[PDB]
Symmetry: D2
Subunit: 295 residues, 4 copies
């Protein structure tokens, strides 16, 4: 037998960093969860019990904190690229670093209509994520994403004209609830290294904001023919607004809300045009995915 692939490192490293403006007294906090996995000439640790090739995962953890101390942690695309580059440059035998970062929301509180200098609220479990793969001699590949954005519209969703055969019981509909948890990923063109990533720094936050805005507006305004059709419209617009993105991927559950027939009870009318009370279904759920790239 032979080692075909191997990677190892530290997962679930929670990091918080505060920035304090001495002039204004304003403080800004960042909190993330980081995973770093390394690859390289490490097969002998598996096959020969040769630990001399292992950068201990505890050391990887230390490196994450030290790197956060000495560098900006925002945008996460930049931080991930600095962190990944560190490992391939520092260690001759390490040839790839894979860095995943999940950014947690700490939103500045408004008290009496003004922004508070040092108090924050977690407004939702929505995350902003990055995956950065730094591969020696092959540059830096970055996938940025948002996840956990949960939305619902109560009308202006339809689903009719699908294939009907002997396995089909679903009725066509011209008015239904549509609700999903959005997972959207945009993949950047390959960057040659850290200098190039630095040169594009302003684009990272702007593109995240654009992706979020396009998702929300399209969802709210589309008279949706299906999840498939609506998500394609979102992806199309993101690609149009940022030329440095190569592909956009959406993965969307269709979280069903079922009508409840109450007619058995005193002829109560609660279906079709009369539907007011529905039963949200925890499972099963549709799952719809697509990856959109350029012609």
């Amino acid at each position: 037998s032979a080692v075909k692939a191997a990677r190892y490192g530290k997962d679930n490293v929670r990091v918080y960093k505060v920035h304090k403006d001495e002039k204004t007294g304003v403080q800004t906090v960042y909190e993330m969860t980081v995973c770093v996995l390394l690859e390289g000439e490490i097969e002998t640790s598996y096959t020969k019990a040769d630990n001399s090739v292992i950068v201990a995962t505890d050391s990887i953890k230390n490196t994450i904190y030290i790197t956060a101390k000495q560098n900006p942690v925002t945008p996460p695309e930049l931080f991930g690229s600095i962190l990944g580059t560190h490992f391939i440059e520092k260690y001759n035998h390490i040839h790839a670093a894979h860095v995943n970062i999940v950014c947690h929301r700490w939103t500045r509180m408004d008290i009496d209509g003004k922004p508070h200098p040092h108090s924050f609220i977690r407004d939702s479990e929505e995350k902003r994520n990055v995956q950065v793969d730094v591969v020696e001699g092959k540059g830096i590949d970055i996938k940025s994403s948002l996840s956990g954005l949960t939305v619902l519209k109560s009308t202006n969703s339809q689903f009719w004209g699908f294939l009907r055969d002997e396995y089909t019981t679903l009725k066509e509909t011209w008015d239904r609830i549509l609700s999903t948890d959005v997972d959207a990923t945009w993949q950047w063109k390959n960057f040659s290294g850290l200098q190039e990533v630095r040169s594009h720094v302003p684009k990272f936050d702007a593109t995240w904001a654009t992706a979020r805005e396009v998702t929300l507006k399209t969802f709210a305004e589309d008279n949706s023919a299906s999840v498939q059709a609506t998500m394609y419209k979102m992806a199309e617009q993101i690609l149009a607004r940022q030329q440095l993105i190569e592909t956009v991927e959406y993965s969307l559950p269709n979280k069903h809300y079922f009508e409840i027939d109450l007619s058995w009870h005193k002829g109560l009318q609660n279906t079709g045009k009369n539907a007011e009370v529905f039963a949200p279904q925890s499972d099963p759920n549709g799952l719809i995915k697509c990856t959109v790239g350029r012609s």
Copy 2:
């Protein structure tokens, strides 16, 4: 042996309701999770296999949907009271109903600076809850709460002057991070029945809003001497603003963020006044509770 206490019913009943304004086209959604447990002269179902006394839990589920169809579901204090009253009035042998409701956030989306008629976002896992106990001949007891409100302040929290003995290693501090998940409950004076609950309907939403506002403002503005001292200030203010509340209870975890000494690495300074990077601790956590009532 004898049955000393017994209650039974249906838990985890998910309900969604939509209200459609025909005039304006504006739609408003409510989503809740409901639990109803009944008590009464039901001991023989346990001791003699006498099912004749059992209102099936499936029927309780049906009743929740039917009641939501025929009544407003907001404020949840009113809905819970209608639902609980139903069971004690409908069934001679049922003498208490215990209704718990968890309200999930569906916040209207703003698209291009205007409120959208029918699209909603889940902004945070914060809940608004009620517990309603309807007891035949003893009225209606209502406890209202908010939970899952997660906040952090990066300075203006202190903790010094605590007991020091041979079990103590904790250093006194004049500047630390304070972060918690707020669980706050206000208990209403007993109501004689549904007519009295109806008479106070406007107070329910207003008091929820006040409790939230007082919590957030006090947390942000208090130069906190301890979690204990800050939470007492919150409870005091809520009791002052609503005379129909008898007690306020807060239950607050102290979610610790630890300094990381980096001095072992090139004399890097990251403690005390130089602390910028911290390690959030998933566990253990302080847990601080208090119930405040009137003199």
Copy 3:
């Protein structure tokens, strides 16, 4: 306003302890999660910012580790009682300690049909728990429990003869699936203090084992008329086998598995006597509780 009730301490303290037999080389591990909350003359920490009355929660954490180092951690009833007694004896102004312990399973592995000296498996998320309340001048109250024991029987459960009215759609049945997660609690007679708890030490593990055995056998053998009837039989037997128990409480979800009518598809028969494929329902669920004491 006044402080009506207050308690504070440390939650989610994870503890592992190993015992090493030097003679046989056999090692035995225990892992628990502990919560300790104190009450006493501590109101001034809330009302006057007087921290002098606070035993820091960090010190409580230290005390848990020190106590585990110097005492047996099994049975958990004994450990909880030692830990709770410590606080009320050590601190003049602390008058009650509330200790909750969750014991996690680490079951010795059998390799090649023999017990391994130092390797363990987590066989299920079933827990053994204790709640110990040590109140100065009022002794020690102990509630022991098992939770997270998930079982299913595929036949020999019935449910018919329940109340039918205009809210009822449920069909009577003489053969259904019954599945639940068992939560069972037995409450001990009050103990005068640690000496008395020590005197009964062998009864704690034996009663846990009896409670588990009675639960499993009764569930498997009862031709169940309802969850209510079956759970009463369990509680009755536990009370009969251990005179030092005052009450037994069961709390049982009824986790529903629904028939799926497939007759719309080529007349396929999958209901009643022909039912083979079912849809487990994640929610809602019945919830049935009872507390059984002595005549």
Copy 4:
């Protein structure tokens, strides 16, 4: 823009099936969670709102139940292959089906030392999984796995001789606790279609059993030089015992248990040879992966 990849279907479909032996009265239950995603000539549903190409996800759900009714559901490798083949054969424009199955444990209860005919216990959250990809003209690729197998050994694990530099604080050790949650996947050689999968049916359960046994024995018996070295030994043995496996992948967290220095308290000795009480760490954790194939 263009659709580069697309797949859609139904996730989280819970299925239970019972087999009843009329002769012996013995009943056997299977419970699974199934996900089916399809690919094919479906781009127009995204780009042109053409639903005519969509097999509704609700129909996919129906198909899962119908298929379970008419076929064995064990071993899951066979069931997944039948289910996947169905879609590519039934629908001309569907060219790949991706089926994931998670099998939940329902273990027959022993009551009074004998196997009960119809009562079952969930002994642990360990799962047996399959991923089956059925691709028209390219056969059937099957990856089988076990996951959620949580183990701990209290000694006979070492970690020394790793790289030490200015980022390293970890001390070498010759005796530590090792605990992990095992995720192991074995990938079968490609099968030409359902006939070939049927021909190997007995190998599926046997190989699962072998993989489990090898994992447990190796973990318990290896005087481990590292997670890397121990996991390689496991993978090597599995490949040796089943020639129809091409690769074995392990993904193992290193769940840390830290010594607690108690010497600050009355010189109490709890480190090194004197370590008895440890603090399990919820995070961060090492994560070690490897894929082993044939020379």
